[PDB]
Write a protein that binds this ligand. Structure first.
Ligand SMILES: N#Cc1ccc(COc2ccc3ccc(S(=O)(=O)N[C@H](CCC(=O)O)C(=O)O)cc3c2)cc1
Length: 433
């Protein structure tokens, strides 16, 4: 596309907003930036000759623009954006600018849980095949920083928010791994509106890959390739567990470093997408056996003195926490940390995992009191995650697990879930020796 001489406004700084700034400048266009935060996260990192407005949206700037580039962190439904949409002013995001320039195929991945693990996995499968691959998007680097004429494949994690402002994506392979309640603070029309945003990823996709076990991942109306536990074009076989494609065994999971059923369906989805992208199967399977997991994803930061302390800080929703608790083996007592910005989620689904004598809850952050309510007799509420740790530490016994899998965003008290996971790791180290 050609942006020469246009009035461009970028809404939202940070890494992404910064990457969009660089994108326009390198193309000979000086945009202007605005952010509803008085002091946004990359402000002092921004070039001097770029006009910026902070502390609110600027309607004068918006209503004058030829193109608005909106961070995924601002709602399209925001009154200033809606007004500019009503006036016919074109609104895109960073993924859209990226898709209009990219000169390699894209694998596109979204879903409420598993999306970064699959994205990473498909990226390692291309690396194992000697393919020059750029991996990023909603994980790692912002898409626009991957753009390179030499790249042979892109693998992108895409959030529901990124998908709302993207229209030119034509993925070689796209998946929605699953859809469970999340971001309800951004979706006033509920779960169906949240799903609808994710369904945008299948539009003009060469192959679509659905989860046979989750109907919501399927288009509204050829067919998609599927993965699943007992069913699907890609599926599990329990003699010991194998991954199979159409009845053929391709890998015995004991060769994987990851474990758990939900990692095995991640592996299936990753394979299916690599297959659709033309990558050789042998090297794809080799990558499955070398991948050790992402940090903050059910990560054992300390196993010592009979106690395992797990950083599952990436659990930012109810679905992810269920994944950790469902089938979880604990010898003695589980000390479960819950807390932060629940985004108006229904926590009920968690209740059925919190019975029996061998469970303790330490609830903190904005929605702490709501998380304790799940079973108040076994629950403590603190303000912070630090205070919670210092409160559970003394009670920890050989055989126990300490599990940070909070079911909420960290953004009420932290920069991001990585900072929360790193703080937990530091404290677990202090308190656990
Ligand atoms: N203008 C403006 C403006 C821009 C950003 C913000 C708040 O700033 C952001 C920015 C970009 C984001 C992009 C994606 C997300 S996210 O919802 O997809 N990720 C969180 C992260 C959770 C966590 O890290 O704990 C979640 O799943 O809940 C949150 C974001 C939050 C406020 C005003």
């Amino acid at each position: 596309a050609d942006y020469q001489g246009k009035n461009v406004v970028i809404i939202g700084l940070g890494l992404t907003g910064l990457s969009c700034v660089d994108f326009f400048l390198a193309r000979g266009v000086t945009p202007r930036v605005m952010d509803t935060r008085m002091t946004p996260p990359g402000l002092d990192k921004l070039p001097e000759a770029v006009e910026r407005h902070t502390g609110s949206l600027n309607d004068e700037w918006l209503m004058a623009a030829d193109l608005i580039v909106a961070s995924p962190g601002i709602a399209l439904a925001h009154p200033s954006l809606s007004a500019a949409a009503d006036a016919g002013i074109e609104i895109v995001g960073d993924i859209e600018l990226f898709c209009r320039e990219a000169q390699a195929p894209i694998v596109a991945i979204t879903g409420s849980n598993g999306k970064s693990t699959v994205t990473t996995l498909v990226g390692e499968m291309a690396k194992a095949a000697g393919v020059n691959v750029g991996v990023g998007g909603n994980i790692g680097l912002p898409a626009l920083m991957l753009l390179d004429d030499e790249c042979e494949l892109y693998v992108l994690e895409l959030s529901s928010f990124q998908l709302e402002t993207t229209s030119s994506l034509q993925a070689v392979a796209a998946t929605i791994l699953n859809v469970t309640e999340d971001h309800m603070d951004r979706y006033p029309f509920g779960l169906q509106q949240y799903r609808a945003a994710k369904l945008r990823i299948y539009e003009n996709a060469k192959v679509c890959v659905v989860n046979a076990d989750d109907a919501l991942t399927m288009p509204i109306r050829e067919r998609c390739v599927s993965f699943g536990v007992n069913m699907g074009d890609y599926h599990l076989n329990h003699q010991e567990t194998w991954l199979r494609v159409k009845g053929e065994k391709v890998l015995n999971v004991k060769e994987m470093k990851l474990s758990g059923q939900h990692n095995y369906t991640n592996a299936l989805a990753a394979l299916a997408l690599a297959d659709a992208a033309g990558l050789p199967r042998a090297s794809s399977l080799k990558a499955l056996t070398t991948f050790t997991g992402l940090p903050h994803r059910f990560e054992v930061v300390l196993e010592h003195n009979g106690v395992r302390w797990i950083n599952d800080s990436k659990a930012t929703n109810v679905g992810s926490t269920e994944a950790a608790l469902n089938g979880l083996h604990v010898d003695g007592t589980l000390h479960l940390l819950l807390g932060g910005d629940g985004k108006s989620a229904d926590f009920s689904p968690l209740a059925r995992y919190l019975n029996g004598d061998n469970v303790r809850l330490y609830c903190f952050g904005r929605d702490g009191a709501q998380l304790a309510a799940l079973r108040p007799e076994v629950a403590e509420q603190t303000e912070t995650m630090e205070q919670a740790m210092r409160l559970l530490a003394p009670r920890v016994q050989p055989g126990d697990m300490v599990l940070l899998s909070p079911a909420c965003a960290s953004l009420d008290q932290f920069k991001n879930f990585e900072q929360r996971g790193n703080e937990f790791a530091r404290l677990a180290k202090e308190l656990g020796s």
